[PDB]
Point group: D2
């Protein structure tokens, strides 16, 4: 039949994949090759099938097709990293003199590319509060090629109204690019809401197993062809290795059941934190006091596996808390099967001036939690123990 | 001791590698992880050791250190592809308004990046015949940041005098970047001749096994740090996967013995071709009639594993010949353990106007051969059979 | 702390694993090595730590420890295959003159080893209906070393009362070995019910991703040491490769959520089949008409992901049905993320005399289904379509 | 054509391998699957192509075919380990009441299987000095099924005359099994000299990269079919993982050039040692004073990469020497790209009574060296330094 016709869990398992025609092997083979051979001079010219992995590969093709199906896009393009997904996309679309309107609340490394790299190539970027679609509209210029957003966004899990922003971008002649890393296609589908291009770090939930760095771009065939044959081939060279593609295919098999459990666990933990008198604030789209709660309910099928919260006692309390957990692991990644915790003020933004962190929504007591697949009772006990100690 | 002190074969085997301290495992472990954990808040801030694979990884570090030792450079940086090695380097070094002087005889995909991508970012490129160092000098401008060369260069294996070009570049305040892919560090060491930065596609000889796409950059620590923390992190995102790094480490173990055999085989095959009346020309640095033979003898320890030659009878003869080989495989890669053959006029440049191919040194009868590790007698027999048939 | 103290899902994620001490890498490194190096002559003799992978390996050790925790056993031993787990166990325990009492309803390849291989080594085997514990007792001899059972058992998913059989075996001085492949430790824990040794094919649910052949043995340290240093080292040589161990560790991360979904899906499908007038019988421990339903409820936490059923119309109907499915895949494995279906009478037991199949509970219309992670509605629709066509 | 017709180096590269028909991928794909799917009920029964990896796999098939070609045998069978190659072979061939005549000078773990395991299965073994073919003849009985030999043999690299022993075994109705691990097919071809079955630990030279544990069996199709469908399937379960097969295929690509360099290096080192006044004896088939030198010249194309030697000063000198090397690595494996050294009296046989070691040819001063691919000058310097210190 056509994989586009099955239910979402069925698609997660099957889309883009089939038994190997030649051998019947059920697992997608790992085509760990650089070289592809032609049967003749004619068959070589015809393709100029496969030719060379940095242009294409059967293992990676399966991943690209699967993710395109899951995001309801025409085509996918795998990359060496989430960063490469973003930069391959933007460097394909933009040239000197062009302009981008970007959310301010975005991944830190994206922010560096946008604030420092792009302008050195003559591409200017305006940063705005994308929670306020009017700020996006006001920042648009005749030269604006792209509006770029992330939702939910760190560090307080604020949201962006994708459909509304898409309409604004399109009326003003720009494309909307959405980083859907935090949600995965299981929880949010930006293309269905009017986005033109979706990017992911598959490093997070899509792979889910904390053992692959990689990215994916999904969009129209016409664009993806340019991202592949110009962006990857002629700019970033950010190809994904076939082994990484195979691991990601393997990881994504369980995307549905993983996201369900991540989100079930996260909701329980969020409610625990909201009831804890030593915790001043809890940021989680699943809590009704979230400023954009109703938007979240329309736009997201589940509230996600990530929680941020503020512990009483500022910087020292935050440090003491992360130093006091015994089960949660101290790390800066997210979307793994293990629960990960970090305290940005002391771990990643320690050198940054306290007042500058504050402006960026990073308070001294802010803790970010990536909820894993453990028993939530064990995670809650670990948190309760650490919070008691830290306060 | 210090690996920098052992003989070159010893370095090939050992440099950058040692038994795992914790377990004694001799093979470098495959650190197929995205996430690294900290023991405390303090240990997390201290590093901001390892943190996240796209910034660094112990497996990839071993490869980088080994290649730095082999090229006699301070530091190495692994990438997702040869292309990414080149673009990460150049996009790190250059910004809008800057200028590059490049050889015309370079890898095709490099040429696209330089001719189309760079100018769209405001970076201008002059192409010159780098076999004539005076053309390099004449093309330099106050804005020139980089001179970029490849040697030997396709498709006729012409050479570039690295030491002479380095002196010219430096006197005029530019860096010299050399693509050393064709030679490998076993056969040529551009840094020892004054180059500032060496790049490779490890996809070719360094890996040697036709199953990895990847690149490497070697140079001063100061530059490599920028290529890593800005180029990779903030521009291309072109990180190498740890599995690919491990395979490359494994492949490079045999670099010395592979290059010796490739070159022994190639010399035999080149001499056979030079004696064949149906072959009009043979391009191989190991043949004394090579226009830059003596330069090759000073600059290269071995003449390489690649040969180009022209078969009598033009386009149709070239097509018939590649369609008539039975052992050599039709492919566009090089540096594999298998002998690979291609006929650019019919396979890769078929759409290109015949007169434009001619200007680029690609004649209708030109065949390129990547000589593998087979018995040279079998390769010669295959070639002899195919040539007889084609003519 | 101690991983033995956390909840079962937490153990699934964490047991046997921790961040790499030296690097902080969260993923268990792949120690793909054969060789381990010593720091001195003394450190070499001391171990005679690690020495050589076929004796031990840090990656494989993590898997062994995890599975020991999950089965509530002292120690684990990984093997090249489920078969090797069984034969390494039995060949370690038994010698010429010894006797084994085995269930008749066991894995086919086990049956070959027991019926043909063992007797040629002077080890005699009695086969009994293990659904009747009295038959086990009656078959025991002074020479009986082992009682061997599988539960649930193919092809009608009959059960064996582990606790009762354990008591009988022990009173008569024998060990009880249980193949727990069908259930996984998530659904059944034979050691907790008195079994001495548990074996698995990890090829099925423990890995769960259809890309690893492997086995595991769990039991007392004293026995496992013998299985390792004599059974593996001196009899079967059936070591697991570190890469396979790593993939299995990765697969087992999702064991809990996978089993929950497999069993939720299977129950739905079983109830659908039980309501279908073209289906004469449905064998599933989750259906109350199962002959040993109550035993199943005490012994198993979930009824499993495997269903067998009989379609009206015998051999031709069974053939037509499996030839008519479009989503379910025709294969003989089980426990994969994809739904797999087979018709033993036409696929695996076709050469076997119809009357002999009947005696073994394999009727002409019997179909076996391994329910995957797809939407159960899609699987049901596929089954409904195929059944309608087949009848 | 037919790979059996090309030169040996060509066969090393190409035999058993070809570009993937479906995709053109040059590297043999890694078919990391457990499950194979059928297109129909009929196609399923027909095979009962591939079915299940423990029975067969396309990646492993390529390795088996290649090694069969290299040993000039009909068929190959890959296994989980060298030990499993040996035991799968012998347990397939022998049953209770049968007898084996074995060399005494064999791999230690083989000796355990033969001396302890076999007799417990009713299979008796006589050990003889296989350097004396008359001892083999004298030990043969009506029940003798197999004569088993290893050549060269540890720990003094004594030889066995394969052709002569084959003739004796055959006249008395037995098969000859030869462990060809030390030589590899590049240096010795026992089947060409009359052996019936060859086994290897591919862990050593065939893989050559110190990162795979595995074995191979090569022999007649009729026997290999039994070793596969009974030995592996019904006795040891010792299947090789497809990833290990792929790594071994990759490693064996360089077998020819590796063996040439190992042996060139070893001869140089052996001659150095023979000239050293602190070294009482040097055991190396390449030295003319080897007791069976001429036999070695007829039977072996190269003298190998392994050397044993005795250092003056017995146990303490041996310990001091291995504790004094700085480049050579202390390990018990062999055939790796790194030079490995061990002192059996202090490292592996330390608990063994000194007088018992002596009987087995293991003197207190005996050192075993596996010569790697380093510059031999560096290895010699390291040895010279250590010997001076130790004495
Ligand atoms: Cl290799
Ligand atoms: Cl997985």
């Amino acid at each position: 039949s056509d994989c586009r016709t099955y239910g979402f869990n069925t698609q997660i398992v099957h889309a883009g994949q089939q038994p190997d025609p030649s051998t019947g092997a059920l697992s997608t083979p790992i085509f760990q090759t650089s070289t592809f051979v032609f049967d003749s001079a004619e068959q070589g010219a015809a393709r100029f099938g496969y030719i060379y992995t940095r242009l294409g590969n059967p293992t990676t093709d399966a991943l690209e097709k699967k993710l395109a199906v899951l995001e309801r896009g025409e085509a996918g393009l795998a990359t060496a990293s989430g960063i490469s997904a973003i930069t391959t996309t933007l460097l394909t679309l933009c040239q000197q003199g062009d302009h981008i309107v970007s959310a301010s609340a975005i991944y830190g490394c994206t922010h560096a590319f946008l604030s420092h790299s792009m302008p050195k190539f003559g591409i200017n970027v305006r940063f705005v509060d994308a929670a306020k679609p009017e700020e996006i509209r006001a920042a648009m210029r005749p030269e604006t090629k792209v509006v770029y957003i992330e939702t939910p966004a760190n560090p307080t899990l604020s949201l962006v109204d994708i459909e509304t922003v898409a309409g604004i971008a399109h009326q003003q002649g720009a494309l909307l690019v959405v980083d859907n890393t935090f949600m995965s296609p299981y929880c949010q589908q930006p293309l269905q809401l009017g986005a033109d291009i979706v990017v992911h770090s598959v490093t997070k939930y899509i792979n889910g197993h904390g053992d692959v760095i990689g990215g994916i771009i999904v969009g129209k065939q016409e664009f993806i062809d340019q991202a592949r044959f110009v962006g990857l081939k002629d700019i970033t060279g950010g190809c994904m290795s076939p082994f990484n593609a195979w691991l990601t295919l393997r990881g994504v098999k369980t995307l549905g059941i993983r996201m369900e459990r991540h989100c079930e666990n996260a909701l329980k933990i969020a409610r625990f934190l909201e009831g804890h008198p030593s915790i001043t604030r809890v940021y989680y789209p699943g809590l009704s006091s979230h400023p954009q709660y109703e938007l979240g309910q329309r736009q997201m099928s589940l509230p996600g596996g990530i929680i941020s919260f503020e512990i009483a006692g500022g910087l020292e309390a935050g440090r003491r808390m992360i130093n006091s957990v015994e089960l949660c692991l101290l790390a800066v990644s997210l979307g793994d099967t293990e629960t990960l915790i970090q305290h940005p003020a002391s771990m990643t933004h320690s050198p940054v001036a306290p007042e500058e962190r504050l402006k960026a929504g990073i308070t001294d007591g802010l803790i970010r939690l990536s909820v894993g697949l453990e028993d939530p009772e064990d995670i809650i006990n670990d948190l309760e123990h650490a919070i008691r100690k830290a306060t």
